[PDB]
Amino acid sequence: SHMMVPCSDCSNGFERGQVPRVDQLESSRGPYSVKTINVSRLARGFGGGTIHYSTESGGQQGIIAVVPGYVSYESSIQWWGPRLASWGFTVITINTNTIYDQPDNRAGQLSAAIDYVIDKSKDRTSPIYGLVDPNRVGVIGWSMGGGGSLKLATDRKIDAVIPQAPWYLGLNRFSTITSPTMIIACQADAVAPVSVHASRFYNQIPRTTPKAYFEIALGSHFCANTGYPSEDILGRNGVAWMKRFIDKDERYTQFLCGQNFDSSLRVSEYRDNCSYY
Ligand SMILES: [Cl-]
Ligand code: NA
Ligand code: NA
């Protein structure tokens, strides 16, 4: 076997840390200090990126890979890295092999990036040696990368998916997705119109699969990217989503359900099937 460091801040399975306040979830950082490892483009199967991780709480950490869109780089999605790592996930934000790569290719690169992290967790020279649980993985993607994230869920066992402003064209198996999926939609999107992409994909996913549709009022296609004005609230729901579905931490259902999120002028629509969480 490979050495795995126990979680030393866990109970009730993988429930890590204390229950936060909503304002803590909305903050730019959770309770843990974020460390980073640069991954060069020489990495197998993707264009490199950055591993974000924390060590205070020990191991058994879920793994998350995050991918950008067409003609875009890691910075567009990088905010998810430190945000989620600060809550006890090992998170790799990536560049793609080329910026022109299409959704199904981006799905394979998310898969490769997960596997890269797993491989490093078995490498005695890596800071993340023994830190991760290869059995608990999630993905996040923007635009064509969001399409890729949904595609990957149909090809690999994925514990949680966050497609943001997703774009996908053609035949798909989204009608069979069993991974808990939180779609972030940008209301005014002219690149991946929600009526064609995000909303349709949400509606396809099985009723028994936990899901959410978080639509940012007036948002452009870029509305969920690094530095945009909804990092606070998108990150609140995203951290809760990954806690609930990667860590199986049911203390976090309260942050996702019964909230009437679209009462805020910032949120044009919120859908969920909370009765199936
Ligand atoms: Cl747009
Ligand atoms: Na590479
Ligand atoms: Na609203």
UniProtKB/TrEMBL annotation:
* Matching InterPro entries: AB_hydrolase_fold, FrsA_esterase, PET_hydrolase/cutinase-like
Please report the organism this UniProt entry assigns to the protein.
Vibrio gazogenes DSM 21264 = NBRC 103151
Family matches, as PANTHER family = DIENELACTONE HYDROLASE DOMAIN-CONTAINING PROTEIN-RELATED (PTHR22946), POLYKETIDE TRANSFERASE AF380 (PTHR22946:SF9)
Q: What is this protein called?
A: Cutinase
Q: Which UniProt keywords apply?
A: Hydrolase, Signal
Q: Which cysteines are joined by disulfide bonds?
A: 7-10, 186-223, 257-274
Q: Which Pfam families match?
A: PETase
Q: Name one GO molecular function term.
A: carboxylic ester hydrolase activity
Give the PET hydrolase/cutinase-like domain ranges: 10-275
